[PDB]
């Protein structure tokens, strides 16, 4: 059985297992954390000798103390396997090593643990002696990995090595100190020297074995893949049946999908067709197309990018908390999910995606407020352009079908008057003259009188009123009616509001862009009504939108920031604060009212303020009208030290008599009368409620069915009419869809009142901040795993057996199916359209559902082991790693790009291959924006730093999404703008570590990574005083080497040729040279060899890499990836400190001193290339760059070669050439046959937009296109492809160049010299 084994190890040592289990066990719950910290401080976990025993002990403890149930325990095992907590612990260590140790005064011997109080270190719990005054920045800032126990004026921090017994007494000193309330307690970690410096073995990634020869196409134990004629069509269909027939189908799919290329000809055997599933063709015809992969998690639709083990563990965790909340009202997990993803519920989300409009009309203000800028039927511009509705309906494309302040008050009077008697043009005239001549809003009669004198065009109708305005009706009615319009729709303030077809669009940045989007969306909405005959010939088009429009607009109910929405769990509120909610004044909703009428309202208000008590009167008024509402009042006062229980006690006595207040003073007087004893138990539950609900003191809030609006600054903002619309809108979206769906399932017996109903509606709203597949028959295409009756998690997978994406999905889903309380149901849907081979690779996923232990009890390493490997097939090893990870090969003796078992058996003697990779870096990536006119600042330079070193890394901001990235490991970092033009123009207020926001408390520039998902940021940069400047326009040798050359090689041969290339440079120059390599495409054999090349030849080297952005279009073929790396990331791949770089292609040899290329002036161009040889006389026919596409495009410009080129990096960055290359590539890449060789084709396609300096032809020689006479004056040779010959590259080198062997001999003896340095 010939096998292949691949493993991955992290760039940091494995933290002690004990501390890892503490962190994994208490994911984010602090009570579990310190409750377990007590247990290990007893010395309770000291008797467990091995990792297995230690793990075993935690299971009994968590179960016994009530921390976890079976479902949460199973989730703990999987998260523990994933080693999710390891980077979180390493964050503590990096912080401790880089900021604590260099800032700590005093000798450290005996000070294993020590509290830090007021910049003083105490090595003893008794606090007798202080060793030092700690230097550096403030350590008391609360950062992401911190935990706090208790509230205290003083802040105490304990840096402990938990492993030893010396920890226990220190802990108890501050645990009790926090329990009393003297100070707040928090624990930080210290690197424990008891543990070894062994690296960490990781999992949650995939390995692929790609077939590199796919040209072929016209039982167990196979030698090679046999290719067949165009009978591919049945592969998916027959493959799907095989599984159904097996009767252990889950295992069959995994076994088939992992080694699929090998089983191709093995399919179609033993009466294979068996189309019993002929009824399920209707399944594919009604909902999803054939061959498509779709996954659902309790209705939630997931794409491939969202399917990572780390991200999926967090989804289950969030989902269980949500469902447990539901099943406290007697609902099964099955009933609960069914209600959440019900059709009537999903319809409401789509319904509220469709915007609601507001009545912008003059009708209320008697038509004397808004000035109609244009008129389509009476303007004499559009008049004759067909006045028909069918002109609008019969349309396609993007064409147009046709048919506050004092000065403002005065100028409104002026314009209004001037319009009324004289007309629009005369009013227009005043405005235009005022703009140029006076240039201010202030009323000018010197300018006004001139307008009456010139534009006095027959003022008909009502007579003129002359020069001065103070009209009792004109000034009063018109101006105050205008104010009533602005107020009604909240169209003023700091940010005014524009209304397009009754849709509010705030006057900010690119509102026209938003307007255009709705303009097209409204047009398509009209067309569909017209085709169905909904519309008629005599109709006003704007009134179709005004059908459901509301007259008044409340910014609280309908915020312009559509994200702004907050809902609380109602069930939680009445069990957490039962002491409070059983003593609040409650007006029960009438029992003799209907379920549809039912709703639950709670008003939180400061009754010691006029606004707070005004708001309650309106709520009481609203309750008289609506018999179905159940009201609560509570009382939240701003003033502290005065008991809130007294005013609540005043009202609960009058509770029976509530809403019998003929006038407002009756409520005012009820608050003042009565003598009461403060229930201090009530006061305690009251302040706990506000803390849980994140509410401040003296702030007014309104809660209907869990949804909260507030804080209410003025009670005039929320009136009786505002409660009615709030109930109307809320009712529609959340209450009505819950009621229908609930009744359809037959759960409408569980609703016993308004409070009972609110629990359900409030929970379903929290779920989003579909069950369309239940229509499908399941008998012949589906299979289930896990108990549906007990399961809380329901997975629905729709996998196509012939897909490569399916390979990953099955492997991950099998491990998640092993969890207790999870149900999985699978659908197989293949395609009949198979033009090429469906799966061209073997796949294995490294993941375990529970930790694995050694024979010695240690934690087992996790690996991808392939056991069904064909001996004669050429394979490529690839890593399918989570997006935040950067991975390279570290240990391998064979060529991972060219694997063959028969050659390894004939050279090494073994049919078993082992390779190890390294998770070298984890990404810090973000999306930047300018402030306040938010756009991507391109060309901006950034620096990442740490307290130890102020220059960890550097990158530049991209145009697309303001993208940037850094390569880093767990720890505390900071982002500063690079010294120069960047800091001159900008200042960055924040790095968006909390979200898009701004969330309060995020005015920070600190970044920390404590997860395998890296760190996602949304930084903000605001321009410095009065700047419209750009980093482009006016207001390396010492660091690296004389010459900087970069290259890339794929195979052992290309790496061997790369060794020759570097040597030829060295022999041919008495200068300093530095070599740069694209790190991830090189072999470990080459990687381990270079220091020996560097010692012999006297050069410097540096490994560089960049991770292919998620937005940027991928390359499925690795050779295409390599080409992209040479052209797409030139500006970001190399550090800012380097002035220029030169690319030389691996199969090249150089006879010249390479400095000359540096000194060559590039005539203000960012990069320079050499053209194709014309010298060969008889080669012409195969010169394709003088034909059709290339000759039409390159009218006079040359066809350049990407074998050798210069990049003036400083100018490249300055010109921002990279951004243009990237977006043109992405745009061109939609067509698959777009770039044959992108590396050559992209600079050639961009040479008119981006200048290309052309090089002397002395710089390149190739036998194929240059004459033999030419080689005497040749500087460098590429070894250009045949193309009509058969001689290989090894042959050309020895025949074409005689000194090639001399270079090869030097490397050969050195390799042997190195080989004898191991026994
Ligand atoms: C962080 O992790 C910890 C640990 O898991 C969680 O903290 C603790 O969780 C446990 C549950 O695992 C809590 O105790 C349980 O409480 C339930 C509920 O019953 C009643 O008791 C509550 C107080 O314990 C109280 O809030 C409610 O009481 C009502 O009635 C009183 C009447 O006087 C009234 O005053 C209140 O206002 C309430 O109206 C509540 O109804 C209880 O059922 C549990 O008993 C279990 O016992 C065994 C297991 O030992 C089991 O066999 C039984 O079936 C039963 O289920 C248990 O007492 C504990 O109070 C929590 N402590 C803290 C500090 O939180 C924490 O919730 C996690 N947080 C997060 C975010 O995950
Ligand atoms: C730039 C320069 O002068 N380089 C010289 C080279 O020409 C000479 O062949 C070699 C051996 O003497 O020493 C060095
Ligand atoms: C489900 O199966 C029945 C026969 O049992 C068939 O009539 C029906 O059309 C099928 N539905 C779909 C969507 O294929
Ligand atoms: Ca070459």
Author numbering: 28 to 245, 277 to 461, 506 to 871, 887 to 1152, 1193 to 1476
Task: Cite, word for word, the article reporting this structure.
Central to ERQC is the ER-resident 170-kDa enzyme UDP-glucose:glycoprotein glucosyltransferase (UGGT). The enzyme selectively reglucosylates a misfolded glycoprotein on one of its N-glycans and promotes its association with the ER lectins calnexin and calreticulin, thus mediating its ER retention. The full-length Chaetomium thermophilum UGGT (CtUGGT) crystal structures revealed four DsbA-like domains (TRXL1–4) arranged in a long arc, terminating in two β sandwiches (βS1 and βS2) tightly clasping the glucosyltransferase family 24 (GT24) domain (Roversi et al., 2017). Overall, UGGT's motions can be described in simple terms as two rigid groups of domains moving with respect to one another.
The resolution of the CtUGGTKif crystal structure is nevertheless sufficient to reveal that the molecule adopts a so far unobserved conformation, which we label “new-intermediate. The CtUGGTkif “new-intermediate” conformation combines a TRXL1-TRXL3 distance as found in the “open” conformation and a TRXL2/TRXL3 relative orientation similar to the one found in the “closed-like” conformation. The TRXL1:TRXL3 domain clamp is open in the “new-intermediate” CtUGGTKif structure (CC1 = 43.2 Å). In the same structure, the TRXL2:TRXL3 domain pair twist adopts a middle-of-the-range value (CC3 = 3.2°). In addition to the three regions that are usually disordered in CtUGGT crystal structures (namely the TRXL4 loop, residues 246–276; the flexible linker between BS2 and the GT24 domain, residues 1,153–1,192; and the residues between the last helix and the ER retrieval motif at the C terminus, residues 1,474–1,510), this structure has disordered regions in the center of the TRXL2 domain (missing residues 461–505); and at the boundary between TRXL3 and TRXL4 (missing residues 862–886). Overall the thermal motion is rather high (= 270 Å2). This is likely due to loose crystal packing. Alternatively, kifunensine has inhibited ERAD mannosidases and our crystal may have grown from a mixture of molecules bearing minor folding defects: the high B factors in this case would be modeling static disorder. PC2 describes a movement in which the TRXL2 domain rotates with respect to TRXL3, with the βS2, TRXL1, and TRXL4 domains also undergoing motion. The motion encoded by PC2 is well represented in the MD starting from the “new-intermediate” CtUGGTKif structure, whose projection in Figure 3D also shows a considerable degree of back-and-forth movement. In particular, the MD simulations starting from the “open,” “intermediate,” and “new-intermediate” CtUGGTKif structures reach conformations with extreme PC values.
